[PDB]
């Protein structure tokens, strides 16, 4: 009923491997997220190819973080084949708007990083985490990316942004994260990565993680 969507973080370097996994998991995942390490090797052709294959939403996790003019150019090339793009809010409103303006014309999505979970985030990013979710709400982006390391914190984030959230659905070991599925709904996404893509049988893993969402 109110089960979140399953987003695969397809963090492999080899395009053949990436394509094999996509074909294998397409019936169980709702979205595929690709980043620069995969895309940088051969360019955006891989996003196009992933799209010839699965007919599911493809999100480019490119952490866009430049001036408006450059953000616009990155957005245009990226959203040619991707369905959505992930941007930083820390570079300011105008930079985010530049990406949104491109996405709107294409009926595609802009997703803002409001909060991160690596240790270094504590210094400058975390102090403004609420300011970022407020800006995501103001600009009406399509979704935000934020951590699930603290369920109570995830609830606070959703309540400020009032937007779909994309968040990890499993911990560092690949096990279920407790007490977040009751916070999320059918417009949110949970991310699973290595626990699927490092398997020799990614289909069975994707099936397992999809069923985990009840």
| Contact residues for its own copies, defined by CB under 8 A | 11, 13, 35-37, 39-44, 62-63, 65-68, 70, 73-74, 77-78, 88-96, 116-125, 128, 131-132
Query: What span, in angstroms and rounded, lies between the C-alpha atoms of 165 and 181?
Result: 12
Q: Which residues of 106-122 are buried (b: 16+ CB within 10 A; e: fewer)?
A: eebbbbbbbbbeeeeee
Tell me, yes or no, if 158 is annotated catalytic.
no
Minimum separation from the CB atom of position 107 to its own copies (A):
21
> Which of 63, 76, 97, 207 is an active site residue?
63
Could you say whether residue 195 binds Cl ion (CB under 5 A)? yes
9 is in an annotated binding site: no
180 is in an annotated binding site: no
Q: Please provide the DSSP assignment of 86-147 as one string.
A: EEESTT-HHHHHHHHHHHHHHT-EEEEE----SGGGGTTTGGGHHHHHHHHHHHT-SEEE--
List beta partners, residue 179: none
Q: Which does 195 bind (CB under 5 to 8 A by kind): its own copies, Cl ion, none?
A: Cl ion
Q: How many CB atoms lie within 10 A of CB 172?
A: 8
**Helix 45-54, helix 15-25: angle, nearest 10:** 20
Given 3-state DSSP classes, what are the helix, strand and coil percentages for the chain, each rounded to the nearest 5? 45, 20, 35
Q: Cβ closer to its own copies: 149 or 212?
A: 149
117 is in an annotated binding site: yes
Q: Cβ closer to its own copies: 6 or 86?
A: 86
Query: What span, in angstroms and rounded, lies between the C-alpha atoms of 184 and 6?
Result: 12
Query: Which one of 23-31, 73-81, 100-108, 195-203 is the stretch in contact with Cl ion (CB under 5 A)?
Result: 195-203
Q: Which does 193 bind (CB under 5 to 8 A by kind): its own copies, Cl ion, none?
A: Cl ion
Query: Which one of 98-106, 122-130, 140-148, 172-180 is the stretch in contact with Cl ion (CB under 5 A)?
Result: 172-180
Q: Which does 90 bind (CB under 5 to 8 A by kind): its own copies, Cl ion, none?
A: its own copies
Q: How many CB atoms lie within 10 A of CB 37?
A: 10
126 is in an annotated binding site: no
Q: Which does 41 bind (CB under 5 to 8 A by kind): Cl ion, its own copies, none?
A: its own copies
Number of H helices, E strands in the chain: 9, 8
Residues designated as active site: 63
Residue ranges in contact with Cl ion by CB under 5 A: 170, 174, 192-195
């Amino acid at each position: 009923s109110h089960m979140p969507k399953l987003m695969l973080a397809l963090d492999v370097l080899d395009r053949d491997r990436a394509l094999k996994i996509v074909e294998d998991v397409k019936d169980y995942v709702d979205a595929i997220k690709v980043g620069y390490p995969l895309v940088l090797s051969t360019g955006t052709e891989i996003i196009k190819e992933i799209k010839k294959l699965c007919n599911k939403e493809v999100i480019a996790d490119f952490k866009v973080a430049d001036i408006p003019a450059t953000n616009e150019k990155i957005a245009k090339i990226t959203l040619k084949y991707a369905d959505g793009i992930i941007v930083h809010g820390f570079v300011g409103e105008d930079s985010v708007k530049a990406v949104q303006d491109v996405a709107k014309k294409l009926n595609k999505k802009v997703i803002m990083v409001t909060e991160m979970s690596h240790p270094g985030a504590v210094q400058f990013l975390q102090p403004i985490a609420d300011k970022l979710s407020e800006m995501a709400k103001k600009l009406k982006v399509d979704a935000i990316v934020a951590p699930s390391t603290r369920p109570e914190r995830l609830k606070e984030i959703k309540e400020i942004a009032e937007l779909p959230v994309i968040t990890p659905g499993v911990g560092a070991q690949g096990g279920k994260i407790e007490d977040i599925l009751n916070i999320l709904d059918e417009n949110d996404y949970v991310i699973v990565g290595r626990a699927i893509y490092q398997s020799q049988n990614p289909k069975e893993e994707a099936k397992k993680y999809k069923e985990m969402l009840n």
